[model samples]
Target: ATGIVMYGDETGVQQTMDQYKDKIESQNKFEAKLGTVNEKKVLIMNKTTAEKMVKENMLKKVVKEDVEPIKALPAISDEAGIVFAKEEQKDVVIDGKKMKYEGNVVIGDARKYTDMYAVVSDAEYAKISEPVKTIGLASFKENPKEKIFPDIKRGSKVEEAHMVEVK
Candidate 1:
């Protein structure tokens, strides 16, 4: 059998280095450096005993995600694109019984009205014309009512907190 050639992690190699630091250094078969690998800080190592360690089942080879070395696109107003999720159309399935055995497919893509409409602030809505604004409020009937609420002290629980230093 071929001796093991690939060791997966830094800890394993570090252990080997510590165990045989003098042997590796004297043989000129050890190399160590502090640098970045795939956008993460890493300590890299190379040793002549790699094959022996792999054969002894001390290391493993594995695949991992690495950041692409491509340059980011510069911000340009004319080619700006907003990140938004688009709903995919799905078929409605009831019981094991088929609805369209002979009849037509009555139901297609059904989604909530709020999903299609992008919400805007009250100030932005006010800037729109009366006819345009009426389209959004056409569904609800005018029912004005005075509202009352009990006076309660506002209190908050810290769900999460984070701190970062400024340069």
Candidate 2:
């Protein structure tokens, strides 16, 4: 899936892109569509996907201040997702929703704000355990890509964590 999760300066998104190897470029047709929300929010993916969703609305950039998270009703399952959520834009967290979880996401506004945004899969994501799973995602440096590895195990492992490095 020649995908990469990147953050920090919007301008820096393309900095080391030149060194990403040919297949990546070839796969993306020599144009990498970064998934960053506007106003310098984080998350790397689908700059087009996100924008297209908005573009469909035809507003292209509609900050729904009303769609903000009011409270974190601890998950019955420890899994959640934040797709390009930033200090400016927050995904409403309730049930079966993405882009509104604990940790690094809120950390951004909390830090003026933020840390390395994380990525997690559904299985591993659910198993990671309440709000703390974020500790698992956050434990990893940048873009906590859960799918990159074969299986990321958690729980009852005395250490409370194990780290993996890909690439």
Candidate 3:
């Protein structure tokens, strides 16, 4: 039985349940601010200012329905992308729907090299889960100072985060 309590860094949950404009049914019991699952109890903090002691429930984003017809899935370690290989791919599922993820070209800001992502059409993006006014992510590879998820650890296995601490 894992216990979780979330406190938003900036405050935007209805979206952060995914941190992506929604929630998934699997973790439904962990909603609210505090709750217990099977039998594990974990504590986490938000940002670095706000933090998260994570293991599972990695990536998340508040999907947008704006002017863009393109959607991207972020992969911090291209290895996750590679291990995600369908010649390099992964799949995200929601409400019983699945989104096929394929790595795009070298995609990200003109910053450091700690970036990776997958892009698809709104035709494909809108079919699965949600989107990004912000993109969500996490990993077993790095320790991230989370803000969008509000400090906690829960769920099964998940992927890596996009805009995470590189140092």
Candidate 4:
């Protein structure tokens, strides 16, 4: 049976570096890095992991709002995702519920939106393929009501968010 290799993380606390090296060399993918191991392992984050992280205040929740023509603000940089999410004419489903979008939301990499209009989170990205994991908001940052709007908080995580398909 092909065994999966496990990795231990942190600085100055490795338990089985020599054994791991020998295993990698046998697989023809030998690599070497010199550092201290801290004993604890780096969490191989996944949906479940993300959920846990979100619950633990490590992940952040993003606010979701309907795109309005009159109330909408100027698109933030790299937030073309706003367009895709609002503009793209396709049917999207959240938790088995379907809704039609008008145009495609063109989103770029994630950014730290301190001002209000933009947000970036590794835990909350529409397209997981985005290299940096940043997404832009479709509406003006200032308009968002801190309450009511589904903003990602420290202890919030989603189980199954969205599924996209063509109409």
Candidate 5:
């Protein structure tokens, strides 16, 4: 056996892995961390559920729920929305049982952006395997919702994060 080698620069490492990850996996183990943020956020839009306050234009208080349903939800000016594609946690079941991911995260304020960043590392890399080994994603919080994800594009072979800087 040779030895372990470490590298730096997220982009470079990602590119190297994309090209040789399969080779590496064949020889040993392979794990990766794509950027992801872990935070609860409310999704509100002036247009999502916004409606004209009054026909008279006098600006009287209307019931919060009375407004007309908004058209297309407007993208937040300085904020971003999350697309949760992975199952974080689940409850165990016995034979012939049904199961689903638990939705436990919530948000209080979602008007402004809250930024965070992280990278997903694997359990083998963590030095021990556990039930949570399937977990992926490493993130950091920055300017409310400034940081973004999917850092790599589809069919792109996940070369690496273009904008994200890992620390």
Candidate 6:
């Protein structure tokens, strides 16, 4: 209960889920309810398998093998998502087979930084005889000193966090 769920910026959500599952299951009964589980499994096969499936149009059949049960878990949350029993249920299985999987996976997306500025040494900056100009830069410098923050956005930093799911 006191454990911290810390994953690095580079760790993936799925891997994070797997790690969380491993950690919690080993220590105690892991229970959680996912508001939605849009799980997808992509087969990482070589070219021939991909080509053959594409040629015969058997892709649907192959992918549909485990479609039913994966889509049919009883909802514990009011909304459609993931659910975990309060106590770990013994002999849990999906699609009528005991394929062990973690409660969730935590994957990290790439860090996107914005509204950042870089400060070069005057010597270095002076080298740009023709300083690059952008419309935003003029506006940014005009109101460099706002009431709450400095007017100049000098610190160029990479801020990152973990996010789940995609549109």
In order, candidate lDDTs are: 0.20, 0.28, 0.25, 0.23, 0.23, 0.22
Tens digits of per-residue lDDT, candidate 2, 36-151, equal 23334232222232232222221111134312222332232235444333333365322344454433232211222222232333343333332221111122223334642222
Give candidate 2's whole-model lDDT. 0.28
Per-residue alpha-carbon lDDT of candidate 5 for residues 1-167, written as tens digits (9 for 90 to 100): 11112222344445544544443421111222222223432111121111221111111111342222122222322222212112343322111122232222111111112122111112212332211111112222332122223332222433222221121
Candidate 1 ranges beyond 4 A from true positions: 1-32, 62-167
Candidate 4, residue 56: Cα displacement in angstroms equals 28
Instruction: Let me know the TM-score candidate 6 reaches against the reference structure.
Output: 0.13
lDDT of 4 by residue, 1-167 (tens): 12122212221112222323443222111111211112311111223323332232222222353211222322222222111232233333322223333232211121121111122222323333312211111222222224212232211231111111101
Please provide, for model 6 over 50-161, each residue's C-alpha lDDT reduced to its tens digit, 9 standing for 90 to 100.
Answer: 2332232222211222211122222221122121222232343222222222232111121112111121222323332322321100111122133212211222211122
In model 1, where is the ten-residue run with the lowest total lDDT?
A: 133-142
lDDT, residue 131, model 6: 22
Worst 10 residues of 3 by lDDT: 42-51
Least well predicted 10-residue stretch by lDDT in candidate 5: 105-114
Question: Model 4: residues >4 Å from true position, as ranges?
Answer: 1-89, 109-167
At residue 102, candidate 3 shows an lDDT of 39
In terms of TM-score, which candidate is stronger, 2 or 4?
2
The backbone clash count of each candidate, in order, is 0, 6, 23, 25, 23, 16
Q: How accurate locally is residue 58 in candidate 5, as Cα lDDT from 0 to 100?
A: 13
Tell me the TM-score of each prediction against the true structure.
0.17, 0.22, 0.20, 0.17, 0.17, 0.13
Alpha-carbon lDDT of model 5: 0.23
Best by TM-score: 2
Deviating ranges (above 4 Å) for candidate 3: 1-118, 128-151, 154-163
> Which model is ahead, 3 or 6, in terms of TM-score?
3
TM-score of candidate 2 against the unseen true structure: 0.22
